[PDB]
Amino acid sequence: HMLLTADTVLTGTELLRPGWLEIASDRVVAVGAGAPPAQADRNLGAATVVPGFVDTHLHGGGGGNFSAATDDETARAVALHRAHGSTTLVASLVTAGPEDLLRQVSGLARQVRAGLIDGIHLEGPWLSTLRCGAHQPVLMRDPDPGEIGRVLDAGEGTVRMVTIAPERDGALAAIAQLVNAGVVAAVGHTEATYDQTRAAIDAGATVGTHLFNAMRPIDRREPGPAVALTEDSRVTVEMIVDGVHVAPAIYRHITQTVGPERLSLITDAMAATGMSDGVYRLGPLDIDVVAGVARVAGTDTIAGSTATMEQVFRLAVAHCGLPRDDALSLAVRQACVNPARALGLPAAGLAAGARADLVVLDHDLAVTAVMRAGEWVV
Amino acid sequence: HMLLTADTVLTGTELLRPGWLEIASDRVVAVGAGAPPAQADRNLGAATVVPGFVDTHLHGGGGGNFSAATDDETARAVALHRAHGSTTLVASLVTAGPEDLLRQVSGLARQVRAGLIDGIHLEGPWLSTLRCGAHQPVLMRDPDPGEIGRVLDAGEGTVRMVTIAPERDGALAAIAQLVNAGVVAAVGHTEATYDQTRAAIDAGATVGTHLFNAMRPIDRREPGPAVALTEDSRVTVEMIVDGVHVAPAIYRHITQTVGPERLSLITDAMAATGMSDGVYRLGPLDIDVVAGVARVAGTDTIAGSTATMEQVFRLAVAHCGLPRDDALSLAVRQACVNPARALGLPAAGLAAGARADLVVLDHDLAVTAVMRAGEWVV
Ligand SMILES: [Zn+2]
Ligand SMILES: [Zn+2]
Ligand SMILES: [Zn+2]
Ligand SMILES: [Zn+2]
């Protein structure tokens, strides 16, 4: 149906130069290096095609908040990230009271079924008040197996990931309850010790919520959660590489520690992504200054990013310390393959049978086109 | 000349079970697996043979202080550690005034030539006063190329390693000066930033002085010296795994990051090693030794260890999280191969032509015999 060629094709596992894809219907039919098996329909130029970006932890964008759980706000959040190459999105909810939580899950679950987003992430309410950040600590509470059951029932299988503070009473049981329901259990926003975090991993936690942020630091006597999470090969750690949340040497250090398959790039994007500076909302209030740097109003407590996956992809390539081609392969694993795997999402690899989600990047790695389900979004 | 057998022989690169070595005079002639090519002279039973331990950073033992620079105190420190398998020793000097420094270097340089010790390590005086520990901060000073030249001349090539605080004025010049003299430049006792430590590494520093101790901690925005040192493959980091200085998960974490060849086990042993408790007055400082645990009398700042390489080898094996055989193989690289390589000392590997330094361990991995220069010390 459509046969595309390009000077660089990243499949998830290989680097094709030049490369070509047969996309036909809604699947990738074939991929290979060299000249295509037939005449091409669209011959791209000096561009790099990568698989669609898979953002597994974001709160909104383009002025829209996923926490609003309305068709209009989700569409405008979805519109921005999709325009920038994020072909899969897991919508994150911050801490909230029991009633609103149920309303938000039900409202978003419809938009998953509708296809705008691919899943729900519960960041809160079961977090630590000492590591709140952009959350309202007063509403945080111990994970109660009754409410957990109600939320997944309300989601009809749409809750994909829940962040848990392993030091709250009943946290290890709640992790077991979540993992038995097929939900990913993540550790974050926690003052848990190394020992308490290691316990959560054995209970079934497999993801680290934005490593080093709202997280006990590494100390020579108390390693904290970050060491437990990077230690265990079952865990995929998140990192915000927007240039603000953690130093590039930290990103480099963790990649060194966990290897190519065990780190997921996320944006933690707030509603200001793609807009201008100004005062915004999340649950409390944010002020956005600098280059879209948001802090909870007058605290220097950083409240998410204003970055897109395109930007974190660019910074990962630039700051990972590898040459460009090796950097592209690493960043594609970290921004596409690994996060979808960690959350049991459809393999982002560009291989025969996979859904045709791909992004076209120019030499400077800016997005020039985006395909999802075999149709051009841009 | 002498043909020894034992059920397990680790050479540095292989695990032989059972194994045999042919020793003639002070060299290893040959090594192999299985039954020996002739009848053995010493048939070791259910023991494990390891290469001699290479302690590249220690301050004394058995009541003796290397800082004393006297035949009697050096003899008693060397005798104890040598009895426990440390067949190669670099004597470390704590911070001291210019006059005292010259006397001590000359005194130790004599004992290098005599064969008691194999080199001198200058830990201080060119360090930061904010991370002194068991040092007298008043005496620390900026590295002056005149005094540095005088110290190496006095040592006649026996000074093997100098710890440098990369944040002191003239630190990057001093590092270049040391490496041009064939001296190892180590980073330690420092508030350097990631950027300042990275500069020192590029200037020729190749060792990190007891990582995480007397060292700026890792922070998400200011990574500090430990990441710079672990990031760069030219650096071998020392670590004290005596159970007191750093948590085993940190040892495990760093090994994960830098790999099997880039960490050196050290003791940092003080004069109370092998003795009883009391107050020991090391480095013109009262040191209270409580239950092996020696800390600067008063504070909770630990002032070195009371461990031997046998003990740090044992704890590394137990806490590295690997299966027994792999733990033995890893620990031998960290306790024998890596430290001798980092300081350009004779390869501790047990291979044809190498000097016959070996250690006999029983089932609990305690030292039962020690060979040096092909002769049994115990
Ligand atoms: Zn968060
Ligand atoms: Zn978040
Ligand atoms: Zn020290
Ligand atoms: Zn020392």
Token pair recorded at residue B7? 């059920």
What span, in angstroms and rounded, lies between the C-alpha atoms of B204 and B36? 45
With beta carbons less than 8 A apart as the criterion, state whether B222 and B197 touch: no
Distance from CA of B240 to the nearest CA of A (A): 11
Token pair recorded at residue A179? 């993992």
Nearest CA in chain A to B320: A231
What span, in angstroms and rounded, lies between the C-alpha atoms of B302 and B124? 17
With beta carbons less than 8 A apart as the criterion, state whether A335 and A265 touch: yes
- Ligand 3 mean position to B94 CA, how many Å? 8
Token pair recorded at residue B40? 């053995």
| Residue B236: CB atoms within 10 Å | 23
Looking from the CA of A16 toward its CB, the CA atoms found within 13 Å total: 27
Angle at B272 between CA B267 and CA B273, to 5 degrees: 40
Distance from CA of B108 to the nearest CA of A (A): 33
Helices B145-155 and B171-180, axial angle in degrees (round to 10)? 30
- Judged by CB atoms closer than 8 Å, whether chains meet at B253 and A257 is answered as yes
Give the number of the ligand closest to the Cα of residue A55. 2
Dihedral pair phi/psi, residue A343, rounded to 5°: -100, 15
- Ligand 4 mean position to A223 CA, how many Å? 23
Matching residue, tokens 């409202």: A107
With beta carbons less than 8 A apart as the criterion, state whether A44 and A9 touch: no
Q: Helix, strand or coil for residue B146?
A: helix
Burial class (CB in 10 A: 0-12, 13-18, 19+), A352: exposed
Q: Residue B85: CB partners within 8 Å, gap ≥ 6?
A: B50, B52, B53, B308, B309, B310, B313, B359, B367, B370
Write down the H helix ranges in chain B.
71-83, 98-114, 145-155, 171-180, 194-202, 225-231, 248-258, 309-319, 324-332, 338-342
Q: Helix, strand or coil for residue A286?
A: strand
Dihedral pair phi/psi, residue A73, rounded to 5°: -70, -35
With beta carbons less than 8 A apart as the criterion, state whether B256 and A230 touch: yes
With beta carbons less than 8 A apart as the criterion, state whether B230 and B257 touch: yes
| Header resolution in angstroms | 2.6
Q: Where are the beta strands (DSSP E) in B152-300?
A: 159-164, 184-187, 207-208, 236-240, 263-266, 278-279, 287-289, 294-296
Question: A263, A292, A267, A264: which is closest to A280 by C-alpha?
Answer: A292
Matching residue, tokens 């004992």: B111
Dihedral pair phi/psi, residue B75, rounded to 5°: -60, -40
What are B234's strand-pairing partners? none
Q: Catalogue the active-site residues of A.
A: 268
Nearest CA in chain A to B210: A220
Nearest CA in chain B to A198: B249
Nearest CA in chain A to B227: A253
Question: B313, B224, B335: which is closest to A220 by C-alpha?
Answer: B224
- Judged by CB atoms closer than 8 Å, whether chains meet at A220 and B249 is answered as no
- Judged by CB atoms closer than 8 Å, whether chains meet at A231 and B249 is answered as yes
Give the number of the ligand closest to the Cα of residue B210. 3
Q: Residue B141: CB partners within 8 Å, gap ≥ 6?
A: B125, B126
The CATH superfamily holding the domain A50-343 is Metal-dependent hydrolases (3.20.20.140)
- Cα B236 to Cα A218, A333, B257, B266, B360: the distances in Å are 21, 30, 12, 12, 27
Helices B98-114 and B71-83, axial angle in degrees (round to 10)? 60
- Ligand 4 mean position to A107 CA, how many Å? 61
For residue B190, the 8-state DSSP code is B
What span, in angstroms and rounded, lies between the C-alpha atoms of A19 and A4? 9
What span, in angstroms and rounded, lies between the C-alpha atoms of B71 and B117? 11
With beta carbons less than 8 A apart as the criterion, state whether B31 and B352 touch: yes
| Cβ neighbours of A246 in B, within 8 Å | 220-221
Please give the helix or strand (H or E) that residue A180 lies within, else none: helix A171-180
- Ligand 4 mean position to B299 CA, how many Å? 17
Residues of A with CB under 8 A from a CB of B: 194, 212-213, 217-223, 227-228, 230-231, 245-247, 249-250, 252-253, 256-257
What span, in angstroms and rounded, lies between the C-alpha atoms of A279 and B362? 69
> Please, what's the largest Cα pairwise distance for chain A?
63
Domain boundaries in chain B?
A: 50-343
Please note each residue after which chain A is broken, C-to-N distance over 2.5 A, or write none. none
Count chain A–chain B contacts defined by CB atoms under 8 A: 65
What span, in angstroms and rounded, lies between the C-alpha atoms of A111 and A71? 8
Looking from the CA of A300 toward its CB, the CA atoms found within 13 Å total: 0
What span, in angstroms and rounded, lies between the C-alpha atoms of B73 and A24? 82
Q: Helix, strand or coil for residue B162?
A: strand
What span, in angstroms and rounded, lies between the C-alpha atoms of A130 and A354? 43
Q: Helix, strand or coil for residue A202?
A: helix
What span, in angstroms and rounded, lies between the C-alpha atoms of A239 and A243? 11
DSSP letters of A214-257?
SBPPP-SS---HHHHHHHSTT-EEEEE-SSSSS-HHHHHHHHHH
Matching residue, tokens 């791909």: A358
Residues near ligand 2 ion, CB 5 Å cutoff? A 123, 268
Looking from the CA of A248 toward its CB, the CA atoms found within 13 Å total: 13
- Judged by CB atoms closer than 8 Å, whether chains meet at B227 and A249 is answered as yes
Dihedral sign computed on CA atoms, order B89, B93, B98, B100: negative
Which of B55, B118, B242, B268 is flagged as catalytic? B268
What span, in angstroms and rounded, lies between the C-alpha atoms of B78 and A35? 70
Matching residue, tokens 């405008």: A76
Give the number of the ligand closest to the Cα of residue B121. 4
